[PDB]
């Protein structure tokens, strides 16, 4: 009878100095054989609390664990900017061991306007017959944002690839990269390229633009 474990919440955003509680529920009496782990940027997990209630060696003292029967709690006593990331529980009572599915914790912040940069295709890429137009939106908050590419005034949806960074561990902002990829011939058939940024920090969309050959 494999031991199942439910973790909750799946995700959460909380402010600085906030008390955060993360729960794991075990399908059986597991006693003190559950531990808590932290993972940032998809890198190595780190043990936080072991045996339900004991702080591990080099872990901030704001982390603590409690247990009530089959309910287990990870508590962060007053959240720090660096605490953004993912938290996991693990039953290690008997084989097979089982991880909770994780909690994605993000930090709330005051608003921050993106710094917007647009980049024409490099002459090195055009030589290869390709043309990637790049727009970078850096250090903004909140995470929600929308980007549109306009070519000579009309929106282009095809050839666009978007990517957003995980929350920054030092200033809680996000960054985004939008690349519009065209063939050199296609790129040379138009004149004006615009990256249009919609974000709550501006009433009207922020525009960065260039004219091909300017």
């Amino acid at each position: 009878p494999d031991i199942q474990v439910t973790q909750s919440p799946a995700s959460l955003s909380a402010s600085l100095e906030e008390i955060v509680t993360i729960t794991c529920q075990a399908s059986q009496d597991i006693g003190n054989y559950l531990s808590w782990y932290q993972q940032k940027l998809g890198k190595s997990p780190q043990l936080l609390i072991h045996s339900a209630t004991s702080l591990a060696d080099g872990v901030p003292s704001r982390f603590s664990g409690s247990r009530s029967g089959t309910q287990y709690s990870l508590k962060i006593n007053r959240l720090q900017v660096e605490d953004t990331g993912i938290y996991y529980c693990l039953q290690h009572y008997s084989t097979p061991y089982t991880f909770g599915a994780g909690t994605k914790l993000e930090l709330k912040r005051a608003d921050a306007a993106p710094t917007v940069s647009i980049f024409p295709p490099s002459s090195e890429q055009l030589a290869s017959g390709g043309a990637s137009v790049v727009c970078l939106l850096n250090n903004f908050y909140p995470k929600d944002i929308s980007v549109k590419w306009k070519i000579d005034g009309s929106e282009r949806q095809n050839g666009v690839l978007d990517s957003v960074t995980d929350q920054d561990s030092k200033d809680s902002t996000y960054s985004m990269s939008s690349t519009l990829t065209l063939t050199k011939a296609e790129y040379e058939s138009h004149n004006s390229y615009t990256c249009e940024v919609t974000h709550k920090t501006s009433t009207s969309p922020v525009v960065k633009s260039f004219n091909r050959g300017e």
Binding site: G31, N32, Y33, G69
Partner: protein, 104 residues
């Protein structure tokens, strides 16, 4: 009858125990009440691994006895000493605790 069953089960374990002496067990500083048996339950993991030549039934039934004895009202947090003990001294210690807590 639960205690004396645990005592004999712990006496059984010590008697048939004495490589596996490298495993490090840990004890509470003070063990004077039934709710302190939580600290024994917490070490059954490693106690199971050393138990090598279906002994699972032995540890499992010790655990149910401990759960019947430690109480149901509260989840007592155990406070362990940092000093480790072999599987032998650990077993002798809890045996002594059982004899200690029976005669009161």
């Amino acid at each position: 009858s639960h205690l004396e069953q645990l005592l004999m089960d712990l006496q059984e374990l010590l008697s048939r125990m004495e490589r596996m002496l490298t495993f490090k067990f840990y004890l509470p500083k003070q063990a004077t009440e039934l709710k302190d048996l939580q600290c024994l339950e917490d070490e059954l993991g490693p106690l199971r691994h050393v138990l090598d030549l279906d002994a699972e039934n032995f540890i499992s039934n010790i655990r149910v006895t401990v759960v019947k004895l430690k109480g149901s009202d509260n989840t007592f947090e155990c406070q362990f000493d940092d000093e480790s003990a072999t599987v032998v001294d650990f077993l002798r210690r809890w045996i002594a605790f059982c004899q200690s807590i029976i005669s009161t």
